[PDB]
Structure 1
Amino acid sequence: TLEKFVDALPIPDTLKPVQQSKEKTYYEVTMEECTHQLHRDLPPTRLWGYNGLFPGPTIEVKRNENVYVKWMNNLPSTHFLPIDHTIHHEEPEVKTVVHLHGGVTPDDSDGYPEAWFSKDFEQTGPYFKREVYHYPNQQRGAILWYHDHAMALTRLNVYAGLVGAYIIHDPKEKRLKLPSDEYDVPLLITDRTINEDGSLFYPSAPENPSPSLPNPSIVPAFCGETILVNGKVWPYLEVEPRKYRFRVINASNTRTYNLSLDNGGDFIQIGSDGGLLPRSVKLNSFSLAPAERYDIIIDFTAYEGESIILANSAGCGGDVNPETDANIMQFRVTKPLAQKDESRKPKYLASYPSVQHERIQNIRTLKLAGTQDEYGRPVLLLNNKRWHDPVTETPKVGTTEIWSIINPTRGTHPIHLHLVSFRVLDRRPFDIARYQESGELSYTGPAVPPPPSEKGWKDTIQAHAGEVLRIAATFGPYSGRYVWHCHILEHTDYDMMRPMDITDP
């Protein structure tokens, strides 16, 4: 396999605006097919990238900054990855739309799956309204990320390389003196399978395919043979012996990571999807499912000279291989100090979410289920409803609801709600056989409150097998048409995604 830790970690340049004033920041980003070398020993790989880059440029904004991005499609008319024509029913083969994940965004700038557009906006989906997306950024400082969200194509377009980081900086956070500038580094983790000739491999069908299957066929999960960070296979990063802030983003299709440091050192978590935790948390390891973000500090002060591997213990379609997917990247604490480390790792970070006292307007019970199609394939469904079924999740603007998510399947699903961040209430185990036979919910143990990592604000949440997960969200500040879905992209596309109407009665 490819030799680990021979390429330096790329750090995506920060995108520069086309126009900027005090009142408005204007960006242009064009999707392009380009080639990039993913490892020292590989020929360049054909990829799809924002501004021709993989990952896309990092976008940095201030809280309340009035930002516009004209996202543009300059991609070929034919995909290079296998399209399954049977999963969705004149239309262009290549459709794109950019979703700012975690964005508190007006609905027509949220990147609705059916707001897609082809090259130069020649053809547009039925929910398309505008070329230039509007991000008011009226929300907590946090790690966001942007990715393609096109109907029935998300797993392919994201795998192609259409991902990037987007960081909101709240000037009120500056007083905490967290590691900043060159000591504040995004880590976008993507697993990939790469052919000998350097081309991306993505399966055309399940292994040993039933003759009943179409060709190509969607697969229910994808586990890549190799791990990349910031678009390089198993890279190294030379770090100074001091505190660093890392913005850890799981930008993988299916894979969940369980991260640790091979010397047994700790992370300090300072943030979740929705921003700073109320209190910092010392952690030896953490789970990171697709689309989750961890804002962490690693203190290299006592580790000068050392090589430390960011390791992974979570299997994907099997146990981890010590030689391959057990490795993420390697820190080498060999960079001389550019100046004194004046950064801090404060304990007191932000207001507790529990300080809020909203009235529970509604309690939604939601099940993670599905059916089988005419070809024998699993179709994953939220509430046994298809994406195209009439909307049922219709919270009122400005109100708070509890969502109780029932998972009787054999796997975890990272459930994501657009627009909002939410509080995690608890998880509770239940009798799966009883639920499947009778629809009756009989608990087999007490409710378990969230770990400290989940006591802040979240937007993507692991709903484990045989458990009921309760979350609480206030729906707003905007009304409109949004979505909620599992963020395993192979599930998202067939068909584990539903519309979410936030109404203004």
Structure 2
Amino acid sequence: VAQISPQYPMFTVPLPIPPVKQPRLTVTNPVNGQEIWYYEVEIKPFTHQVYPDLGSADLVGYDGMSPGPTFQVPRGVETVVRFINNAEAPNSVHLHGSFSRAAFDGWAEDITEPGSFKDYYYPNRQSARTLWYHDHAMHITAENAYRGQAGLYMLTDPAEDALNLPSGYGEFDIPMILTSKQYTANGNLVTTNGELNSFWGDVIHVNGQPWPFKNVEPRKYRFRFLDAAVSRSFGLYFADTDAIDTRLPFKVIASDSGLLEHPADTSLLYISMAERYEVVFDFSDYAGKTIELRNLGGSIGGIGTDTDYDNTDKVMRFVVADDTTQPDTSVVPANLRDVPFPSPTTNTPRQFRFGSTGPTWTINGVAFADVQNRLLANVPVGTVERWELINAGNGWTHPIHIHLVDFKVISRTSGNNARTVMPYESGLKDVVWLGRRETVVVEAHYAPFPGVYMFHCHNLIHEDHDMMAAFNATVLPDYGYNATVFVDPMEELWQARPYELGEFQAQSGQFSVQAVTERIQTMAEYRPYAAADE
């Protein structure tokens, strides 16, 4: 259908690369003698000239940019991030892909008001994976994410580095953060406010830039795909501009939770809101060509319900040089890793229906705001459960996310007989797309931390009104590990605190090296992540 946003000069602006976020300082953890990396992020307003010849867009971003800066954290290094709200609305930061404690996980009611900050303590102990950090504030997650509160968080480890995959952040390892937005006639953003169905968007962005291009050499690149859109799901494929409908093969090497056991040879990648897939594309057979990254129409080939617009079949262009300037020393091994799959269970699976209750998107008839009813499962820590995630509807799709866990996709049935489990769903994930009339069974180890966690649809419009619920990963009162201060996401110990911008700017008072060092060493003594040792 006709583009609504003004006409854009397609494939004329280079793909931006978010800068790497550096820690401000390190603090010795008195528990283990190891260095904790401490970071400060200021959430604040900024303008960005998206349309060359119109006005600017009003955004709110981590460190005044969108996407937020990229974190790059070695496995085993604990991080503390001071998220400082200097904006106009509350925030709640979630690190998507991290088994964070309940009070460091971005619980939707666990907000920071403007003129407050919160310190988030992250374990970084899971398998090498592409995480992302983004807003989770109750009822305003769609508008906070849409206006710029999302960024990448790469968890790295030597074992993955030894595979010799294409490497170097911004060299041959490229972030590909997809969004779908809409602009006014003067080049400002159309708000998601008031939208209760889906905000599709008619402008496709990579790393915050409409329809970019990149100069590539004829060799192998690792692309880290993330669907950070409010509502748009994608069917990604690559094509030579000399044969724009001919799909070129590539390899998926990783899903949400890390490496697949083996690369999945693929010509079409379904990716829905909050899914991460890492792809290796070999440009060597296309020296001197232009390869367009494109998006499947027909509402992702009948899987989705998304509206299609004139230019939503276009993502970006890669202009391939005639030659490499340096040898391609990278490879994609046939064997990537032993995926740590959960033990099969015979426990009769729980059922969750993703539908509506009057004008509200619900789970088993319940809206997140409804405290009395929204706690839908008690799961003893250590237990493996199958959850049957049901989309009975033909008129909506729902990428379902479960906090804390990594899960295996056991099965998919389609009431449109459209598809079962995709080859790139063979490993571990934390989001799974319920297409039209789809039921998916996932299996997860509810481990290793007790606490109250969210699960929900990651269509941020659905999530906000109000397709989200909670589970309690439970322990018996003799469990230990300071569980009584780490189960409650709203625990007073970990709540946000007020700051004065002067102190922040001068790095004085509670921002002094001394105050930060004392505050982090005190936090570290509670031993939040001790139960994940081994």
TM-score interval (norm. to shorter): 0.7 to 0.9
- Look up the match of 2:367: 386
Paired residues for 1:48-447 under 5 Å:
48-76=60-88, 94-121=89-116, 131-181=118-168, 182-202=171-191, 217-263=194-240, 264-315=247-298, 320-321=308-309, 323-334=310-321, 337-354=324-341, 356-361=342-347, 363-372=349-358, 378-387=359-368, 388=370, 389-390=372-373, 391-410=375-394, 411-429=396-414
Post-superposition offset of 1:359: 4.3
- Look up the match of 2:435: 464
1:159-189 superposed Cα distances (whole Å, 9 cap, x missing partner): 1111111111021111110011011011101
User: What is the SS of the residue equivalent to 1:158?
Assistant: helix
Where has structure 1 moved over 6 Å in runs of 4 or more? none
Partner Cα separation in structure 2 for residue 248 and residue 429 of structure 1: 25
Partner Cα separation in structure 1 for residue 75 and residue 306 of structure 2: 42
Partner Cα separation in structure 1 for residue 37 and residue 452 of structure 2: 25
Partner Cα separation in structure 1 for residue 142 and residue 385 of structure 2: 30
- Look up the equivalent residue of 2:258 and give its one-letter code: G
1:382-424 superposed Cα distances (whole Å, 9 cap, x missing partner): 0111212331222111110010122211222100001111000
TM-score normalized with structure 2 length:
0.80
TM-score normalized with structure 1 length:
0.85
User: Does the 8 A contact of 1:239 with 1:335 survive in 2?
Assistant: no
- Look up the equivalent residue of 2:428 and give its one-letter code: W
- Look up the match of 1:84: none
1:80-99 superposed Cα distances (whole Å, 9 cap, x missing partner): xxxxxxxxxxxxxx211111
Partner Cα separation in structure 1 for residue 306 and residue 336 of structure 2: 38
User: How big is the alpha-carbon RMSD for the aligned residues of Structure 1 and Structure 2?
Assistant: 2.0
Post-superposition offset of 1:158: 0.8
Post-superposition offset of 1:315: 4.9
User: What is the SS of the residue equivalent to 2:201?
Assistant: coil
Rate the CA distance shift 1:151–1:173 in 2: closer, same or farther, 3 A: same
Rate the CA distance shift 1:43–1:383 in 2: closer, same or farther, 3 A: same
Post-superposition offset of 1:31: 0.5
User: Does the 8 A contact of 1:13 with 1:58 survive in 2?
Assistant: yes
- Look up the equivalent residue of 2:205 and give its one-letter code: L
Partner Cα separation in structure 2 for residue 491 and residue 458 of structure 1: 21
1:117-168 superposed Cα distances (whole Å, 9 cap, x missing partner): 11122xxxxxxxx821011111011111111000010011111111111111
- Look up the equivalent residue of 1:479 and give its one-letter code: P
User: Does the 8 A contact of 1:241 with 1:335 survive in 2?
Assistant: yes
- Look up the match of 1:3: 9
Post-superposition offset of 1:358: 5.0
Post-superposition offset of 1:228: 0.8
Partner Cα separation in structure 1 for residue 24 and residue 306 of structure 2: 47
Partner Cα separation in structure 2 for residue 318 and residue 26 of structure 1: 41
Partner Cα separation in structure 2 for residue 358 and residue 504 of structure 1: 22
1:46-103 superposed Cα distances (whole Å, 9 cap, x missing partner): 1111000110001111112111111110003xxxxxxxxxxxxxxxxx2111111111
User: Does the 8 A contact of 1:73 with 1:117 survive in 2?
Assistant: yes
Post-superposition offset of 1:338: 4.2
Partner Cα separation in structure 1 for residue 353 and residue 307 of structure 2: 28
Match of 1:481 among 452, 464, 489: 452
Partner Cα separation in structure 2 for residue 297 and residue 57 of structure 1: 23
Q: Which runs of 5+ in 2 are unaligned?
A: 1-6, 28-33, 241-246, 300-304, 477-534
Post-superposition offset of 1:469: 1.4
Partner Cα separation in structure 1 for residue 277 and residue 422 of structure 2: 14
User: Does the 8 A contact of 2:166 with 2:220 survive in 1?
Assistant: yes
- Look up the equivalent residue of 2:239 and give its one-letter code: D
**Which has more helix, going by share of residues?**
2
- Look up the equivalent residue of 1:97 and give its one-letter code: S
Q: Which runs of 5+ in 1 are unaligned?
A: 77-93, 122-129, 205-216, 373-377, 431-443
Instruction: Give the total of aligned pairs.
Output: 447
Post-superposition offset of 1:501: 1.2
Partner Cα separation in structure 1 for residue 51 and residue 163 of structure 2: 38
User: Does the 8 A contact of 2:339 with 2:428 survive in 1?
Assistant: no
The sequence identity of aligned pairs, in percent, is 36
Partner Cα separation in structure 2 for residue 346 and residue 39 of structure 1: 42
Partner Cα separation in structure 2 for residue 320 and residue 467 of structure 1: 21
- Look up the equivalent residue of 2:8 and give its one-letter code: L
Partner Cα separation in structure 2 for residue 315 and residue 25 of structure 1: 46
- Look up the match of 1:88: none
1:435-464 superposed Cα distances (whole Å, 9 cap, x missing partner): xxxxxxxxx98x986221111001000113
- Look up the equivalent residue of 1:320 and give its one-letter code: D
- Look up the equivalent residue of 1:415 and give its one-letter code: I
- Look up the match of 2:509: none
Partner Cα separation in structure 2 for residue 50 and residue 62 of structure 1: 21
User: What is the SS of the residue equivalent to 1:200?
Assistant: coil
User: Does the 8 A contact of 2:206 with 2:212 survive in 1?
Assistant: yes
Partner Cα separation in structure 2 for residue 336 and residue 27 of structure 1: 40
Partner Cα separation in structure 1 for residue 306 and residue 386 of structure 2: 35
Rate the CA distance shift 1:328–1:19 in 2: closer, same or farther, 3 A: same
1:292-344 superposed Cα distances (whole Å, 9 cap, x missing partner): 111110111121221111000145666634x4111001111138634211000
